Amino acid sequence: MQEHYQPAAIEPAAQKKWDDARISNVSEDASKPKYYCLSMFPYPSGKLHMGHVRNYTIGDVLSRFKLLNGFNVMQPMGWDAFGMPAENAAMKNNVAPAAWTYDNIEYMKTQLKSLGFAVDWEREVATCKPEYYRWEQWLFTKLFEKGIVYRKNGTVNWDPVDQTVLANEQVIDGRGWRSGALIEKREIPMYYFKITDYAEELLNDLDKLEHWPEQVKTMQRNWIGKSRGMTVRFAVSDDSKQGLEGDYAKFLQVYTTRPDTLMGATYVAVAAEHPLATAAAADKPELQAFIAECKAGSVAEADMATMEKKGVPTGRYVVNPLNGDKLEVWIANYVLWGYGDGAVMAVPAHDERDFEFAAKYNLPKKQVIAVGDNAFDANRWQEWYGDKENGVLVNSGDLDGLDFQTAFDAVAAKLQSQGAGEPKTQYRLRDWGISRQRYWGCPIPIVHCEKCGNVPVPADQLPVVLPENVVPDGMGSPLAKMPEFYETSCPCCGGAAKRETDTMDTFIESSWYFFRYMSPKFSDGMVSAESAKYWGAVDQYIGGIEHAILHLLYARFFTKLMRDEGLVNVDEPFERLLTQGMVVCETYYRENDKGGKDWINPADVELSAVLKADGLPVVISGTEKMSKSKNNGVDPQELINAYGADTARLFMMFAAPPEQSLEWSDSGVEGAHRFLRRLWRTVYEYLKQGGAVKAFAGNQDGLSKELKDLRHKLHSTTAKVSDDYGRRQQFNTAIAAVMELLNQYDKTDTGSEQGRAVAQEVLEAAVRLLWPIVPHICETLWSELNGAKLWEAGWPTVDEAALVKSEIEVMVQVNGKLRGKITVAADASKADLEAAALANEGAVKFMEGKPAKKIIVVPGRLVNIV
Ligand SMILES: CC(C)C[C@H](N)C(=O)NS(=O)(=O)OC[C@H]1O[C@@H](n2cnc3c(N)nccc32)[C@H](O)[C@@H]1O
Ligand SMILES: [Mg+2]
Ligand SMILES: [Zn+2]
């Protein structure tokens, strides 16, 4: 054994040993229990940084733990390859997105191999490859013919100067981000998943996920946004019907989640596009101007909660069907057309928004709900005004005194008897818009024929292949300019036709890749039946909280869709979810000649701080999440060249609990490295003093107290680490526990024959307990200690006999006079000592049937019965 730890030498040799043994290349082996551990696959956008590494190290720790416990572990990796990163790199470097992507994949794959993750690379997928995306095209066509996918007009941001559709993220102040031109709202045909048809299933099945973090479930419930409310119709007054047609001339319909407050409605509000709005604005130029301002605004929820709520009165009136009040209709900028009725009732006394709107325009506030003896002031909003759970109705006729639910059901019965309303369930969830006017994405398998319409591509003709010989330049999608792509024949009639040139939302690839990993070379379907039956669902999923809503909801939705197609037999894709904390790092910049800032990478600066290239100073700025945005991503390859993969992995796992943020630290890397040399030094010095022996096992009676204590520490440590990897998933405390075992080891004389056997037992356990964290050094150290294969020796077992301490002899006194002796456990409570002392032979004789006035218990010394 070499004296000094040399990771540059031992880490490649360990990886080759694992690769040759194929321990990470797994089949559907019925002779072993399966374990599927998945980390969220990365965008191949250039280089991974230590943040990504922390994510994948957490997954590798969990995978290697289960591997050591005899599981058949699948831990797959792949590339989430479509999307805007490559399209942007094409506009900057004039290179093809495919070429840029496959280049990044090659570099990133070596980054990962360098870290020694226990990954089944035979299951690698790259989602921009036809052999992958043909199957989401397949599912698209199957759902399109069921109407689950459908085509309909939708709104987009059209930039008239750049001649391109813009995402909302690039529309600032109503204008294009790179053009500054006024953005036009265009209606264009697009494709949608009818995810609203699955809202109830998606919501209710969250209750099955007993091992998900509750905040993620809460975020999904709030996003789906189910409500149980009431449709309510207000009859249009006789004087207010001019210009109104059909049902709009007869009533104004709204939806409310508080029908228990309908007796407190004091006005009604409608969207600018509502037919009552347009009819009252016929002769009113002020309402026309207000309607136009509304249409020229951002309907985004991000802007609307921060939006000043405004309105104008219409001079039209409707009638409350419960109390007969005549309420004026207002046009209001917060009521959105298309979200149900486009009209709402207002109850200022019990809704905070209505209260402020009514305080602005001095509109009436009518209390209809009281909470106990609480004081109600119409000139100040109090949180109890909206309390739905502890109120009763006041000022409500025969509804007075009821709670929320009873009033809700009573209002429903009364409204239904008059034909003026009925219960209704609504969801905030909207259908999922699939179409992207972008090149680097999965083509939509639709052919447009002037005779047949929108026709899906037959399954025998999939994939519709995206051409890779393309360099986009933002002047619109190049697919719409390539007739050798869009010119085709109709699959139904054979006539000339045109391929759809929009591509798919790239969330589609990540909505099912976890099933493709189960059979990534299967060419007859999305996933083979045998492999889906074997692997079931993902046992453990690890990824950032930024994907807790959309990505997870889409993945759950695709799972249910695939189940409904008979492709899988699980309802939910991920059984457990670990959301790792972000790795953060200080940033550095230099003022640009254009007045901007040149963000510099920490690996190219020196520290007052200077750039490592010229010696001129650079500015030290704030510490934030590692990302390419501020160029503060630490490349693991640089850490590995300087210290080794095990150091990188150990620092990430030790610096903080996995869910807590983790600050980059040169000092932390050095501490991790010193511990690895301590571990190496410990085993080297042990083997220098005599060589390897058979580890102690079996009956420890006759071992010295010092060695019994070390075995107690050993098996306590094994129990703790097993619980930290397996239940708590807290790796920093697992490493700290092994450090404590070594500290006790260092303080124990292990030179005797029995001492060397216990030493061997301790070291053989330490190196296996740490193998999930630092497998390279632990693999090498194991092989110097023991001849068996580490993965066949398995996870260390807890010797329960090593955990029992010795019994203690206690004196039994009666009124301070020694009357007997008792033997009790070291863990014996004060009540067990009292029990045992009272039953002592000499005690019961010298008590003379008299009861104990008091019993004094000195733990480990005596019991005095008075
Ligand atoms: C399933 C797909 C939709 C995932 C998608 N391709 C993606 O986000 N791909 S990705 O490549 O963007 O991130 C891959 C994973 O790495 C984490 N991750 C990123 N930055 C990190 C940081 N600073 N600290 C710590 C962790 C960090 C990030 O949460 C994610 O789980
Ligand atoms: Mg269950
Ligand atoms: Zn046709």
Curated annotation (Swiss-Prot):
A motif ('KMSKS' region) lies at residues 625-629. Its EC number is 6.1.1.4. The keyword Cytoplasm applies. Pfam families: Anticodon_1, tRNA-synt_1, tRNA-synt_1_2, tRNA-synt_1g. Keywords: Aminoacyl-tRNA synthetase, ATP-binding, Cytoplasm, Ligase, Nucleotide-binding, Protein biosynthesis. InterPro entries: aa-tRNA-synth_I_CS, aa-tRNA-synth_Ia, Leu-tRNA-ligase, Leu_tRNA-synth_edit, M/V/L/I-tRNA-synth_anticd-bd, Methionyl/Leucyl_tRNA_Synth, Rossmann-like_a/b/a_fold, tRNAsynth_Ia_anticodon-bd. It is found in: Cytoplasm. Its main location: cytoplasm. ATP binds at residue 628. Gene3D superfamilies: 2.20.28.290, 3.10.20.590, HUPs, Isoleucyl-tRNA Synthetase, Domain 1, Valyl/Leucyl/Isoleucyl-tRNA synthetase, editing domain. It catalyses: tRNA(Leu) + L-leucine + ATP = L-leucyl-tRNA(Leu) + AMP + diphosphate. A motif ('HIGH' region) lies at residues 42-52. Coiled coil: none annotated. GO terms for biological process: leucyl-tRNA aminoacylation. One of its GO terms (molecular function) is aminoacyl-tRNA deacylase activity. GO terms for cellular component: cytosol. PANTHER family: LEUCINE--TRNA LIGASE, MITOCHONDRIAL, LEUCYL-TRNA SYNTHETASE. Belongs to the class-I aminoacyl-tRNA synthetase family. This is Leucine--tRNA ligase. It comes from Neisseria gonorrhoeae (strain NCCP11945).
